[PDB]
Each structure stands twice: as C-alpha cells, then as structure tokens.
Amino acid sequence: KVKVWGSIKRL
Amino acid sequence: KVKVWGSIKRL
Amino acid sequence: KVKVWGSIKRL
Amino acid sequence: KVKVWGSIKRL
Amino acid sequence: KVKVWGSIKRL
Amino acid sequence: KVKVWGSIKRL
Amino acid sequence: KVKVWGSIKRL
Amino acid sequence: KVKVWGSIKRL
Ligand SMILES: O=S(=O)(O)c1cc(S(=O)(=O)O)c2c(/N=N/c3ccccc3)c(O)ccc2c1
Ligand SMILES: O=S(=O)(O)c1cc(S(=O)(=O)O)c2c(/N=N/c3ccccc3)c(O)ccc2c1
Ligand SMILES: O=S(=O)(O)c1cc(S(=O)(=O)O)c2c(/N=N/c3ccccc3)c(O)ccc2c1
Ligand SMILES: O=S(=O)(O)c1cc(S(=O)(=O)O)c2c(/N=N/c3ccccc3)c(O)ccc2c1
DSSP states (O other), X not given: OEXXXXXXXXX | OXXXXXXXXXX | OXXXXXXXXXX | XXXXXXXXXXX | OEEEEEEXXXX | OEEXXXXXXXX | OEEEEEXXXXX | OEEXXXXXXXX
C-alpha cells in the first residue's frame, strides 16, 4: 500500500 | 491543476 | 509532483 | 518488506 | 519543523 | 468537526 | 487525533 | 538532530 500527496495538471 | 491525495494498492 | 510513502513486499 | 518515503514526478 | 494531518472537534 | 493540516515551527 | 512528522534539534 | 513519525491525541 502506498499513500500519495501532490498535484496533477489534468483530471 | 488539481491537488490530489489518497492511497494506491500497488505501483 | 507527488509525495509518496508506504511499503513494498519485495524489490 | 521495504518501506519507502519520497517523491515521484507523475502518477 | 513539524507537519500535521488530522482533525479537531472545534475551531 | 474540522479536518486540519499544515506546519508548526516547534512543539 | 493528528498524524505528526518532522524534526527536533535535541531531546 | 532527531526525526519523528507518529501521532498525537491533541494539538
Ligand atoms: O505538495 S503540494 O504543494 O502540491 C500540495 C498542496 C496542497 S494545499 O492546498 O497547499 O494544502 C494539497 C492539498 N490541499 N488541498 C486543499 C483542500 C481543501 C482546501 C484547501 C486546500 C491536497 O488536499 C492534496 C494535495 C496537496 C498538495
Ligand atoms: O523526502 S522528500 O523531501 O521528497 C518528502 C517530503 C515530504 S513533506 O511534504 O516535506 O513532509 C513528504 C511527505 N509529506 N507529505 C505531506 C502530507 C500531508 C501534508 C503535507 C505534506 C509525504 O507524505 C511523503 C513523502 C514525502 C517526501
Ligand atoms: O486522518 S483523518 O481521517 O482525520 C483525515 C482525513 C481527511 S480526508 O477528508 O479523508 O481526506 C483529511 C483531509 N481532507 N480534507 C478534505 C479536503 C477537501 C476535500 C475533501 C476532504 C484534510 O484536508 C486534512 C486532514 C484530514 C484528516
Ligand atoms: O505510525 S502511525 O500509524 O501513527 C502513522 C500513520 C500515518 S498514515 O496516515 O497511515 O500515512 C502517518 C502520516 N500520514 N499522514 C497522511 C498525510 C496525508 C494523507 C494521508 C495520510 C503522517 O503524515 C505522519 C505520521 C503518520 C503516522
């Protein structure tokens, strides 16, 4: 299991 | 742009 | 960019 | 078992 | 420096 | 109830 | 409850 | 220098 926290440029 | 957070089961 | 943390069973 | 803490450029 | 992630019952 | 996140300089 | 992470200069 | 990773019951 991996947790993620950030941003993406598009959905 | 979208702020994104959560979990992923595997890479 | 995404900050990532968690566990992996094997390399 | 291995634990990870860092960043990735894309999901 | 310390980072926090959680909940509080009141402001 | 309130979800809270951020940074604190010292305890 | 709050998840907490960071650094402290000395005990 | 010491690094910390855990939880606290209140801010
Ligand atoms: O590492 S980043 O700089 O890319 C960064 C920065 C933020 S944040 O805006 O500064 O805190 C968020 C984030 N926060 N999102 C808000 C949700 C509700 C209200 C306001 C903000 C989020 O939910 C997920 C990922 C994030 C990644
Ligand atoms: O070694 S790195 O410099 O690449 C580094 C730095 C951070 S951090 O932002 O400075 O603490 C994180 C991280 N933290 N993520 C936040 C989660 C919620 C709120 C704010 C931040 C995370 O969950 C996983 C990996 C990380 C790797
Ligand atoms: O550890 S907890 O279970 O107490 C937990 C759970 C959440 S969350 O709702 O499931 O992701 C958050 C959180 N998220 N807040 C949202 C912001 C914008 C939209 C939706 C949600 C947040 O910004 C800060 C702390 C949180 C702590
Ligand atoms: O050892 S503990 O079980 O007490 C534990 C567990 C978690 S965790 O939620 O399972 O990964 C965290 C943590 N993670 N916090 C999130 C930040 C952003 C999004 C989701 C979660 C954190 O930033 C600091 C300390 C933690 C300590």
